[PDB]
Amino acid sequence: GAMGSMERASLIQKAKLAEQAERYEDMAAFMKGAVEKGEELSCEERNLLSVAYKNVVGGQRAAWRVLSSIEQKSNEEGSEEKGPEVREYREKVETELQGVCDTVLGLLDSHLIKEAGDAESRVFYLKMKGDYYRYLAEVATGDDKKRIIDSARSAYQEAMDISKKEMPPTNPIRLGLALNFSVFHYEIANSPEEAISLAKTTFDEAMADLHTLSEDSYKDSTLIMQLLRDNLTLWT
């Protein structure tokens, strides 16, 4: 890999500089290089990896949705035929998006998940696995669509089972997991009632545990609780 000659600590330092500069493709390449050194990641380093790739795939998803909308309109009744270019360019952005998701899934499988023994690291990585299968499912249309959806579901379910046994209901990893699994049910699995039930239960169990928290922990947990409430407002 092109980062193989750079020290681990220098890759982490440069990932933080790239974040300040809003250079998220660079940030992701630096963090990929750090993972490939083979050592486990600290909490802060896990968050740098996820922020970098979220920003890269987020720009690809936004572009894909614009292009897919134009393509679908061109397939309506009365729309002028304009040739293969819209489909070709949507396909180009799709293939790039798939490549990024495959890169993240490959880092998780070789070897981040198998070396993660503490609940906080294991749940974080299994959540990420569910998220990147979810982004693959948003663009999937062929023979493997069902299997891609089931891979997202299976990763999120294993993460949920560990989080319920090992973490309090206010823990920010547990809350963000439940938030994103609820989005999976609503947007991917055609299961809006499951989405609303999960978001409601998660919100109520977190509310009842806030009394145990410091001011700083309370701020972290209530920020995510607000996102659950905002989705419930959109979905009901």
Binding site: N47, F124, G176, V183, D220, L227, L234
Partner: peptide, 10 residues
């Protein structure tokens, strides 16, 4: 339009 989260406060 739905909200999701990639990070987890340390």
């Amino acid at each position: 339009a739905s909200h999701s989260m990639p990070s987890a406060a340390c």
